[PDB]
Amino acid sequence: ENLWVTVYYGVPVWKDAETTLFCASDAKAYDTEVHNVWATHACVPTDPNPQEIYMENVTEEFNMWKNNMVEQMHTDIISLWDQSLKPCVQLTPLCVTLDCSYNITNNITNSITNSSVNMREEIKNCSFNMTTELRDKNRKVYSLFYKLDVVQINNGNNSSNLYRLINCNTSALTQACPKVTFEPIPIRYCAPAGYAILKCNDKEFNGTGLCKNVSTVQCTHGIRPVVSTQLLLNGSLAEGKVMIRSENITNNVKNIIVQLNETVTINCTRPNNNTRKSVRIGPGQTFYATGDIIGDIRQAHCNVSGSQWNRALHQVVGQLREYWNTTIIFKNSSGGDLEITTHSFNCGGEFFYCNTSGLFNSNWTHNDTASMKPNDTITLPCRIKQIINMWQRVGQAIYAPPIQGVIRCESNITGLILTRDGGGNINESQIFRPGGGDMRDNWRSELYKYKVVRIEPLGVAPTKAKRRVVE
Amino acid sequence: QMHTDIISLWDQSLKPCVQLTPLCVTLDCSYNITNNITNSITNSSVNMREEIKNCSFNMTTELRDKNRKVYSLFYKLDVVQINNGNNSSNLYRLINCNTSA
Amino acid sequence: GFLGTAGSTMGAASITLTVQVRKLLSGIVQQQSNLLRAIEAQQHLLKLTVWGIKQLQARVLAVERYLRDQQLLGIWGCSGKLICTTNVPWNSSWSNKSEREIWENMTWLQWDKEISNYTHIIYELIEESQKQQEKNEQELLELD
Amino acid sequence: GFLGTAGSTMGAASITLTVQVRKLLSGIVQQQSNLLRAIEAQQHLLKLTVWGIKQLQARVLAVERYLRDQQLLGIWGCSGKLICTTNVPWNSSWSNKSEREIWENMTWLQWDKEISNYTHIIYELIEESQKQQEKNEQELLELD
Amino acid sequence: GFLGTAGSTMGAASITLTVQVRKLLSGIVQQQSNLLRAIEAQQHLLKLTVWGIKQLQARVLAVERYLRDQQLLGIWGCSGKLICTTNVPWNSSWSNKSEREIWENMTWLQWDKEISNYTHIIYELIEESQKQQEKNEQELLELD
Ligand SMILES: *[C@@H]1O[C@H](CO)[C@@H](O[C@@H]2O[C@H](CO)[C@@H](O[C@@H]3O[C@H](CO[C@H]4O[C@H](CO)[C@@H](O)[C@H](O)[C@@H]4O)[C@@H](O)[C@H](O[C@H]4O[C@H](CO)[C@@H](O)[C@H](O)[C@@H]4O)[C@@H]3O)[C@H](O)[C@H]2NC(C)=O)[C@H](O)[C@H]1NC(C)=O
Ligand SMILES: *[C@@H]1O[C@H](CO)[C@@H](O[C@@H]2O[C@H](CO)[C@@H](O[C@@H]3O[C@H](CO)[C@@H](O)[C@H](O)[C@@H]3O)[C@H](O)[C@H]2NC(C)=O)[C@H](O)[C@H]1NC(C)=O
């Protein structure tokens, strides 16, 4: 009867959280017995029993664009990079001037493919001074380099011109600590006490909005946090239906996230063998030079099954009718920078910039058979890079090492990020195009189900009973 | 705690700063320079002792061998003359240099 | 049903309270396996950085949260157990209701939703009104 | 009344205790509002040194003193609330003085300094001679 | 009896508990004499290192252990005293025993040699049954 206000404890309560999640991994990352493979800071191992408990008859609004996990995520990634970079020796003497010859005693100088990658063969080899362990002694050593990591100077425009590194004239560079690897590891972000992570188990749930099929969880599932521009590699699948997401679907600047339910064997590869030469500069300064390769040296390139691309495109364009029944066009990005213009990723230390130009050459306006029936395997040119400035910050730069041997990157694509045209008509013809300046969406494209929540166990309710009384 | 935390914060702020080890190299400063005024409003043994000199010295590019001359301005408090030689001969040296880093 | 298993349950949610508090401060079970003592995988350098130290800070902050909880429970005479009786009747400010519909037609979420503002008041009552006017024992009747 | 409301009082001081405690232990809301996660406006390097780790260490040490306070409360069975008597009679070590005039004209320190060591020895005595001498039950008259 | 006090006892050491509980959460004692604000004598560099963070995180883990202990105690609803008994007896699953001779021939460790197959049974059974089975109030027999 009376509203005697009683208190209770031990029931879930939901509020937004700002905290940190922690490492997790299997035995491989610690059975490798390398100093640290690529997250390893005496990181906690994983929990073999994920207590992912399912809840129903509740609902909540979920958003990945208001999420704080991505900011802390890339902050921790930069911390990993810096901490792994502390043991790396400095490469300021490596910036010293270098004289190059383009042609060498290789069997092939212009390979079979011609997609503006062989015309700009971008292969030279240069000699330059370095320090000997005796300060009074220096010595000229030679290695191999491309044209992307350097630029011409002293413009006697073409007579054996010397070159200079792009990042040294503005920033600092250091070794990559070649003993550390660069491949991903299955991660499972874990929740500390006082917090939890809610996975939206609704098979139909798009990016944001209301979700009900709740899964309260302490530690996430297996994540493969690899960087990619315009693409999602080695990621999860789309359950039940192709997923299409956008912050403001009406607005055009907001990028469009796509998650497929069918993968593709993307093999970007350098088959021709590589070279490594460890050369002592100083007491600790040891440079890993790209030696002179023996045999035929073709430019590194890449392969995809364009037929699976075509059928997955039929799927997504059957799904893409937001306000339409048949209109779509794809156009390549008309400008920007190489870090955003191509599909850039890291693999075996080498930064593979594989050129995803095979998308826009298509007109799926009404019919899909005309591009599904030409089932054909696509070969494409993929460039290689040694240095990088991750997240566009001009600070310390990494010099990835030679990879001596061959390089294969065979992987599963599962998603894409795009943008619709800026100055597009109202209903004449919609246009999409690729965009990769936002490096942050690649990480929320899988944590979209995951929302971090605090825990306020306090509860209150009225009842008719009462506590002890004296008089 | 006040002075301790002060010196600690000054150290922590000193860490991200860049270094000036090769900037410590020898110099040559001219006192008399292309300027008109030498007698300021006050004369208490500080105007004739104008304590302003324009001074050249070598510096290094990001590379090793690349070195280029460059000039700046300095007072008398920052440097001292090497009287060890016969005379000045436009020979000066920083004191914070030849005491510490 | 480790922490949740109350989908549409308020009165039925008045019996599964302890299954939540069993795993409240059990992040230690998730933390004891860190093996961050000096080295885990092969070896490490000093390598004890923002991740580890601020994980420790988060341990500290959750500990402080639940300790300030436990001390304001003790202020309420409430550390004895989860179910926590009060001598406080609600001042007549809410709308019409029933002793069961409030206790039956929600899932422990709608309550804190609709009692956002008022909640503070009740605290101070159970913080002060239940406490100051408490006396020690009785005088008249006993075993003999 | 964080520490005030008692210039020389024992009655008013004893009445103004909870305000002092709830104002003293409000540091957790200061700790929640740090917002020092990596960066304050634009960019920062690590910047975590003896200053911050020993801020946290001072937090730990002060709250550890408080943990020992709750330990004391658990020892004496004194964890119920602040109103908590003692079964020991005050020995004659003190020098002659009246009770209410100590309540009114010693501000709780002119008493403590005079009974400081005796407070320590009687702390020890109330810890030892109190809890070990609790009988189990009485069977003459009970519920059944 | 700093850490000793039981050479060979099962009942005599049932009341010597307070000496070791006095030091269960006493990390501040050895710490007070450190003078570790940043320096001791005039000045020093930062100098807090893997050693320092190791002792800090060690204090953290010890405090965490103690907090989990008191959490377990509070869950049982039996925190009012260290020596507190149970409303349920033990299943006669060991060898048919004798209380007296069992209380004579072990340094409070031999009893623990036959419990790894019986630890969880006791733990979970008590923690669930002896906790959930506490109803709210009595009805008939009171002053009135
Ligand atoms: C950084 O650079 C130089 C190179 O070593 C050093 O700087 C100081 O150099 C002076 C002299 O070279 C040291 O001694 C002082 O010299 C003052 C001026 O020089 C007269 O005296 C010297 C003999 O000492 C003669 O050779 C010279 O011709 C001059 O006649 C003197 O005045 C000092 O004595 C007294 O003068 C002052 C001002 O009147 C008085 O107020 C004082 O009481 C003082 O006693 C003194 O003889 C001087 O010591 C050097 N500084 C330091 C810190 O050592 C530094 O040594 C060098 N850094 C390092 C680390 O070596
Ligand atoms: C790789 O090289 C082959 C040839 O070895 C390229 O194919 C050739 O491309 C040129 C240039 O587009 C074609 O010539 C052009 O023809 C058009 C008319 O179609 C004319 O308007 C232009 O002025 C020019 O003459 C040429 O016909 C074509 N030949 C063949 C056999 O394909 C190929 O395009 C190159 N790869 C890439 C990616 O460009």
Ligand SMILES: *[C@@H]1O[C@H](CO)[C@@H](O[C@@H]2O[C@H](CO)[C@@H](O[C@@H]3O[C@H](CO)[C@@H](O)[C@H](O)[C@@H]3O)[C@H](O)[C@H]2NC(C)=O)[C@H](O)[C@H]1NC(C)=O
């Ligand atoms: C993801 O799924 C949700 C549904 O769970 C989609 O919800 C969208 O909701 C809005 C409002 O409820 C619908 O109407 C629109 O409202 C805005 C104002 O908010 C108004 O400006 C528009 O003109 C329109 O009336 C909207 O139709 C609905 N979307 C769909 C596709 O039905 C959300 O759009 C989905 N988002 C993505 C990126 O797929």
Ligand SMILES: *[C@@H]1O[C@H](CO)[C@@H](O[C@@H]2O[C@H](CO)[C@@H](O[C@@H]3O[C@H](CO)[C@@H](O)[C@H](O)[C@@H]3O)[C@H](O)[C@H]2NC(C)=O)[C@H](O)[C@H]1NC(C)=O
């Ligand atoms: C790109 O990568 C994918 C997977 O990483 C490659 O798929 C696999 O390709 C190999 C040959 O390169 C196939 O093995 C061969 O299959 C044929 C036909 O069954 C057989 O006659 C041969 O003896 C040999 O076993 C393999 O079956 C295939 N994987 C699957 C699941 O079918 C793909 O070939 C790569 N593409 C390029 C251009 O490198």
Ligand SMILES: *[C@@H]1O[C@H](CO)[C@@H](O[C@@H]2O[C@H](CO)[C@@H](O[C@@H]3O[C@H](CO)[C@@H](O)[C@H](O)[C@@H]3O)[C@H](O)[C@H]2NC(C)=O)[C@H](O)[C@H]1NC(C)=O
């Ligand atoms: C992507 O896949 C294609 C085709 O699977 C690879 O093409 C390879 O191209 C080279 C020449 O550019 C071929 O070399 C010659 O092949 C013929 C026929 O097999 C042989 O008789 C010659 O002695 C010579 O070896 C090579 O065969 C061909 N690969 C295949 C499987 O036919 C391309 O290398 C792949 N990788 C990329 C684009 O990175």
Ligand SMILES: *[C@@H]1O[C@H](CO)[C@@H](O[C@@H]2O[C@H](CO)[C@@H](O[C@@H]3O[C@H](CO)[C@@H](O)[C@H](O)[C@@H]3O)[C@H](O)[C@H]2NC(C)=O)[C@H](O)[C@H]1NC(C)=O
């Ligand atoms: C990424 O791949 C795309 C195509 O997959 C590249 O675009 C294409 O590049 C070729 C070679 O530069 C263009 O061919 C042009 O043909 C005309 C014919 O007259 C000739 O005059 C030009 O000199 C040039 O050779 C082609 O038009 C162009 N666009 C297409 C096919 O739509 C792109 O360059 C690649 N980017 C990188 C960074 O690898």
Ligand SMILES: *[C@@H]1O[C@H](CO)[C@@H](O[C@@H]2O[C@H](CO)[C@@H](O[C@@H]3O[C@H](CO)[C@@H](O)[C@H](O)[C@@H]3O)[C@H](O)[C@H]2NC(C)=O)[C@H](O)[C@H]1NC(C)=O
């Ligand atoms: C996929 O392509 C097929 C054709 O290959 C489309 O179907 C047929 O398209 C033709 C020409 O577009 C239609 O002819 C029409 O004839 C009337 C006079 O009878 C004329 O007034 C129209 O302007 C047009 O020329 C034909 O009716 C149409 N048939 C069917 C069954 O659709 C098909 O529509 C394409 N797919 C999609 C989704 O549009």
Ligand SMILES: *[C@@H]1O[C@H](CO)[C@@H](O[C@@H]2O[C@H](CO)[C@@H](O[C@@H]3O[C@H](CO)[C@@H](O)[C@H](O)[C@@H]3O)[C@H](O)[C@H]2NC(C)=O)[C@H](O)[C@H]1NC(C)=O
């Ligand atoms: C998909 O790839 C396969 C090979 O990996 C292609 O196989 C053969 O491709 C030729 C043309 O490229 C087909 O020729 C045509 O065959 C049809 C009968 O199916 C005939 O009516 C046409 O006049 C022409 O001769 C050939 O049939 C095909 N092989 C088989 C067994 O069908 C295949 O064409 C590729 N499909 C597409 C849509 O590109």
Ligand SMILES: *[C@@H]1O[C@H](CO)[C@@H](O[C@@H]2O[C@H](CO)[C@@H](O[C@@H]3O[C@H](CO)[C@@H](O)[C@H](O)[C@@H]3O)[C@H](O)[C@H]2NC(C)=O)[C@H](O)[C@H]1NC(C)=O
């Ligand atoms: C996406 O995931 C796939 C599946 O794991 C990756 O393929 C595998 O990549 C690893 C290295 O990341 C390969 O192992 C390496 O092989 C070299 C060969 O010399 C060895 O020296 C290394 O120590 C290491 O064992 C593995 O062969 C390869 N293929 C599989 C598992 O079939 C792929 O690399 C991932 N994507 C990217 C961009 O890395």
Ligand SMILES: *[C@@H]1O[C@H](CO)[C@@H](O[C@@H]2O[C@H](CO)[C@@H](O[C@@H]3O[C@H](CO)[C@@H](O)[C@H](O)[C@@H]3O)[C@H](O)[C@H]2NC(C)=O)[C@H](O)[C@H]1NC(C)=O
């Ligand atoms: C701060 O200003 C004072 C005031 O000038 C400087 O101290 C010294 O002041 C006396 C004035 O009594 C100067 O004495 C001069 O002596 C000559 C010869 O006997 C006489 O003709 C002048 O009329 C004057 O009395 C003395 O030169 C001056 N010292 C210096 C070094 O200039 C003091 O040095 C100033 N401090 C700073 C840090 O600027």
Ligand SMILES: *[C@@H]1O[C@H](CO)[C@@H](O[C@@H]2O[C@H](CO)[C@@H](O)[C@H](O)[C@H]2NC(C)=O)[C@H](O)[C@H]1NC(C)=O
């Ligand atoms: C570029 O590479 C060629 C590879 O041949 C270098 O020339 C070789 O130098 C080695 C060093 O003694 C000799 O043993 C080979 O006989 C040389 N081969 C040829 C074909 O000359 C050349 O020095 C390199 N140049 C630069 C600038 O790095």
Ligand SMILES: *[C@@H]1O[C@H](CO)[C@@H](O[C@@H]2O[C@H](CO)[C@@H](O)[C@H](O)[C@H]2NC(C)=O)[C@H](O)[C@H]1NC(C)=O
């Ligand atoms: C405490 O109460 C205020 C007002 O009662 C809440 O403000 C709500 O604000 C939104 C938008 O401004 C209104 O649409 C609601 O009607 C307001 N609530 C009410 C009950 O009128 C405020 O959100 C409450 N505080 C918290 C923490 O929930």
Ligand SMILES: *[C@@H]1O[C@H](CO)[C@@H](O)[C@H](O)[C@H]1NC(C)=O
């Ligand atoms: C919700 O999750 C449960 C898992 O217990 C699953 O059986 C059910 O199909 C899911 N429903 C939806 C709509 O995702």
Ligand SMILES: *[C@@H]1O[C@H](CO)[C@@H](O)[C@H](O)[C@H]1NC(C)=O
């Ligand atoms: C992917 O989802 C679409 C629905 O959008 C469905 O038509 C297609 O069959 C699915 N493909 C799979 C599960 O391979």
Ligand SMILES: *[C@@H]1O[C@H](CO)[C@@H](O)[C@H](O)[C@H]1NC(C)=O
């Ligand atoms: C999306 O953007 C359009 C214009 O760009 C604007 O009219 C609309 O209100 C926006 N909607 C949301 C939900 O931001």
Ligand SMILES: *[C@@H]1O[C@H](CO)[C@@H](O)[C@H](O)[C@H]1NC(C)=O
């Ligand atoms: C060339 O490639 C072969 C692979 O067949 C490899 O065994 C060899 O070591 C390579 N040559 C080098 C690294 O000089």
Ligand SMILES: *[C@@H]1O[C@H](CO)[C@@H](O)[C@H](O)[C@H]1NC(C)=O
């Ligand atoms: C699509 O059709 C248009 C005709 O308006 C043509 O200009 C364009 O080149 C076509 N797309 C491709 C990739 O060729």
Ligand SMILES: *[C@@H]1O[C@H](CO)[C@@H](O)[C@H](O)[C@H]1NC(C)=O
């Ligand atoms: C890619 O998918 C195939 C099956 O679709 C699977 O066998 C393979 O292991 C996957 N590779 C990845 C995820 O790297």
